[PDB]
Ligand binder design. Structure first.
Ligand SMILES: *[C@H]1O[C@H](CO)[C@@H](O)[C@H](O)[C@H]1NC(C)=O
Ligand code: NA
Lengths: 45, 259
């Protein structure tokens, strides 16, 4: 998960390193009921 | 949230409830970005015409919740505010441009399976995902409809609501209303002929519009529920504060008041 750190923990506090990874889903390799709906819409060109 | 569904437990662990102390009432949504910083909409904190001109001491935030009213023992956490920061260019007298604000918690919140921060977008994630047709997700405890009959009808959800919605082309957003739209705003929702529907509504402001990066599997907050004309109206769309475009302000406030 190549995430680029942007804030300074001294002023931001803890949490940025593991941001956006949900304990009950991504952390356990489980998908919620409708996220596939989102991912399938990110096509491009 | 209109035409949405009940959220799964822990589906949106960065969800935050903005509460007024006296009288005790739910004001807006917000989002957790760190153990001590919370993001929300400016008009939720300052809009004199609609009884809103709060100070750090008039408010409280509840984190890790699911039920709108039920106290969830040893799961939800309540935090007081140390300081509120409103965008300097936000001017309620003219419009809702730059509808963004930051709230610093008196003390850091502890993370759990139900409390976790969301990420803020970098420029490549922003360029990659902010495209018409791409779907984002909006969550909140706001109203389920524009109006209802008090007590007999039901306009307030029992638990957190969620709805996935597609980003709409700017020209389409602009032609949908006479209200002046700025680059600090983006809109989303289904088109009238799509048949599918959904939208945010009163009480959802300050809540996040998120997207999941297909590049690193992380959830990013691209927008903040800001305003709309009615709720879930054909030919109308919900408007959101453009988070990436105001990221420089977020940065400035933080290494200047974070400690
Ligand atoms: C908030 O208070 C009033 C309305 O209550 C508002 O007009 C003003 O801009 C804000 N600050 C004060 C108290 O002047
Ligand atoms: Na609509």
């Amino acid at each position: 998960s190549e995430y680029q750190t942007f804030f300074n923990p001294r002023t931001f506090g803890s949490g940025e390193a593991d941001c956006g990874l949900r304990p009950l889903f991504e952390k356990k390799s489980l998908e919620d009921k409708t996220e596939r709906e989102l991912l399938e819409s990110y096509i491009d060109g | 949230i209109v035409e949405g569904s009940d959220a799964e437990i822990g589906m949106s662990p960065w969800q935050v409830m903005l509460f007024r102390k006296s009288p005790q009432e739910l004001l807006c949504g917000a989002s957790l970005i760190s153990d001590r910083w919370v993001l929300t909409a400016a008009h939720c904190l300052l809009y004199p015409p609609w009884d809103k001109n709060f100070t750090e001491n008039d408010l409280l935030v509840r984190i890790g919740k699911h039920s709108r009213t039920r106290y969830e023992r040893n799961i939800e956490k309540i935090s007081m505010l140390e300081k509120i920061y409103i965008h300097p260019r936000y001017n309620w007298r003219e419009n809702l441009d730059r509808d963004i604000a930051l709230m610093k918690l008196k003390k850091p919140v502890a993370f759990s399976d139900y409390i976790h921060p969301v990420c803020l977008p970098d420029r490549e994630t922003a360029a990659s995902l902010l495209q018409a047709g791409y779907k984002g997700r909006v969550t909140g405890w706001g109203n389920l409809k524009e109006t209802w009959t008090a007590n007999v009808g039901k306009g307030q959800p029992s638990v957190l609501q969620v709805v996935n919605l597609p980003i709409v082309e700017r020209p389409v957003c602009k032609d949908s209303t006479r209200i002046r739209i700025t680059d600090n705003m983006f809109c989303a929702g289904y088109k009238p002929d799509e048949g599918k529907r959904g939208d945010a509504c009163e009480g959802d402001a300050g809540g996040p519009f998120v997207m999941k990066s297909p590049f690193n599997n992380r959830w990013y907050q691209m927008g903040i529920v800001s305003w709309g004309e009615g709720c879930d109206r054909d030919g109308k769309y919900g408007f959101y504060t453009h988070v990436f475009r105001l990221k420089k302000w977020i940065q400035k406030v933080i290494d200047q008041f974070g400690e």
